[PDB]
Structure formats: structure tokens, C-alpha cells
Amino acid sequence: SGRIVGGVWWFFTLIIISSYTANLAAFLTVERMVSPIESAEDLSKQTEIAYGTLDSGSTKEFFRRSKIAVFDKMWTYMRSAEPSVFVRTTAEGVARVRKSKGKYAYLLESTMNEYIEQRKPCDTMKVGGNLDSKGYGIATPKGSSLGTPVNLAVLKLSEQGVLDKLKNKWWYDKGECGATSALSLSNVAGVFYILVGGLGLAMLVALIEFCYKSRAGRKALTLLSSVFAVCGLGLLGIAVSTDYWLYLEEGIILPQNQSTEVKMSLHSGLWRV
């Protein structure tokens, strides 16, 4: 009769300790499969991060006119998506990236993307290469006496590193931000806290045994087995006769600062809902 209770408790812990290790190996594997976005083909396949452009301009007209396979797929997703993925202002599209926790990507030019990356708050980053290739130029009125010496000045500043020196000055030197696969201490920190807390608790008990060993019936157990049996009749007697067992909500979220509206909030019991 003592070896059945010792036997079914041994089978209990064989399932639980094998369930702790196997669920931890399922967490650490899925957390290792996570590939962040580093291309447009990663956005075209993963239809769980929403992405959009500005409501007007050259970026929205790029995907509308494109006949490349990965870019036709991105325009097909963006033209039919609820709600609208197209923001109206550049400051609105950076705002949606910063408040969607990583579920929204924004398609903008490469020089604002490297600039907003270097401005507080340091929330955003630039991933992947450029989708197209264009350029910024110095323009002249098509009949000027000045367009040819300006043309030879840009190609001289580019080869003297001045266009690279001035870009580092205004994007990075006047920037506001900066610039292991193994299990860290921060994940298992709380098992060192209970270890240190379990050693200090046990040296406290070593005092109040030593003070109890050095210094030194039916009346106590009659008193103690009555007040625990009354409160056993109490605390279960209140609990089964009340209706505060299951706080349940069935609300819905909004993608507007996570606006929360409950619709089926409730508190239940074994006999009242």
C-alpha cells in the first residue's frame, strides 16, 4: 500500500519533467527559427507583417507600374488590404511603425530611412537593399551657361569624397542614436534567486533549531484539528455558494493605440453566470 503511492508518484514526475524539457526545447527551437525581414521577397511571402507606402508619390506609382514578380506581388497585397495600408504623411507612416510592435513595415526612400534611423526615438531600422535605383541631381534651366561647370563639379566632389564627407556629417555625425545563440543569465535568473533565498532561509532555520535544541500533546491537536476543520467547512462553504469563480472577457482590439472595447465581460460560478 506504500509502494503504489510511491509508484504512481514516480510515473507522475516522469511525465512532468519530460514535459518541462520538451516544451522548453520547443520554445528555444521556434525562437531560433525566427527570421527577421531582410528583403522584399521576405515581405512578399510573409503576409503577417503588413506593409504600405505613402498615399501618393513615386513610391506608390512604382509598384503600380511594376512588372517584376516580387513587386507585382507586393502591389497585389497592398491594393486589396483591410484596413488601408497607405498612410498620408511620412510622419504618419513612421508613427504606424513605432506603434504596431513590429507588425507594420513602411516603404520609403533610402535617405529618409537612414535619417529617421538616426533620430530619437531610436525605434526603427533599415533592412535589405534598395528596391530600385534612382538619383538626386542638381538641375539647370536647359539653356543655361552653368549646367556644364556644375556637371563637372559634382563629379569632382564625388571623387574627392566631399559628397561622402557631407553625408556622414548630416546623417551620422549629427545623429542622435549610437553607431550569441547561448542561454543567458537573464532567462534563468530566478532559479538563482530561489537558490540564494533558499540558502538564507535555511541558515535562519539553523538558528531557531539551535535556540530550540539548547533551551529544551493532545491539548494542542484537539485545538488545531478543530479550527482547520471549521475553516475547511468555511472556505469551501463560501466558495461553492458564491459566484466569483471565472472572470471572463471576450472583447475586441482596435489598431488605434490598442483601443479596447469589451463586449462579453462576465464573472461566473457553479450556479450563476
Binding site: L185, S186, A189, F192, V196, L199, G200, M203
Partner: protein
């Protein structure tokens, strides 16, 4: 955040709580030695003292590996006193080698009672120095 240095300060609050208990028990046993007693205060003290070194000897090898050179530095004056009381002044004994071999020579009583309040003054400052740099490395 929790780090390896911040664990080496958590692990020495718990052991310096025993080091002050080595000294509260060290001031009472000499106070009860003057009221009465030799051969019992031979043995009861002689068991205590070697645990007091190697727990502090742990701290010298624990803050060495934690790269805490100021905290290793403040334990250096208690360390090199502890090597002198065992390598050069051992109070021979022919046994566990501390304050047993002769007791009532009346000059070592004055030296132990100055030591018994010098240990408690060091350990009670060590308890709050370790508690500060615990909370320092956890917050920083």
C-alpha cells in the same frame, strides 16, 4: 540586471551573516571565560576559527574571478592578517592550532578581546558594503 558580479555580492551577504555569528559567539565565550572553564573554551572556540578563514578565503577567490578589484582590495587587509595568525603565529597546540594550548596567560586575553571587537567592526561594515554593491550592480 542580474549578472555574474551581482551574484558574487548576493552570495556573500549570506555567508557574512555567518561570519558575524562567528564573532557574536566569539565575544560571549571570552566573556563567560572571565566569569568562571579552560578545557571547554579550549575546544568550543578551536572548532570555530578555521571556518572563519576559508569562508573569507572563498571571498578572495570569488571576487578575483568576478573582476571586482576594489572589493578584492578591501578584503586584502583582513586576508594578510589571517595568514599571519596561521603561518607565523600559530599558537602551536599540536592539534587544531588556535586559542586552546594556553589560556590564562593574561596577555593573550587582552589581544583576543581587541580582536573580537575588531572583527565585528569589519564584518558589520562588510555586510553593508556588500549590500550596497549588490544593489549597485543590480540597478546599474
Amino acid at each position: 540586471a542580474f549578472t555574474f558580479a551581482a551574484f558574487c555580492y548576493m552570495l556573500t551577504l549570506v555567508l557574512c551573516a555567518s561570519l558575524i555569528f562567528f564573532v557574536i559567539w566569539h565575544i560571549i565565550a571570552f566573556d563567560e571565560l572571565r566569569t568562571d572553564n579552560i578545557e571547554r573554551i579550549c575546544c568550543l572556540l578551536r572548532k570555530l576559527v578555521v571556518p572563519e578563514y576559508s569562508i573569507h578565503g572563498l571571498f578572495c577567490l570569488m571576487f578575483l574571478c568576478a573582476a571586482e578589484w576594489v572589493t578584492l582590495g578591501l578584503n586584502i587587509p583582513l586576508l594578510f592578517y589571517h595568514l599571519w595568525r596561521y603561518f607565523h603565529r600559530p599558537a602551536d597546540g599540536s592539534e587544531v592550532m588556535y586559542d586552546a594550548v594556553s589560556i590564562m596567560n593574561a596577555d593573550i586575553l587582552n589581544y583576543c578581546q581587541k580582536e573580537s571587537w575588531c572583527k565585528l567592526a569589519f564584518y558589520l561594515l562588510s555586510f553593508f558594503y556588500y549590500l550596497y554593491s549588490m544593489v549597485y550592480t543590480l540597478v546599474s
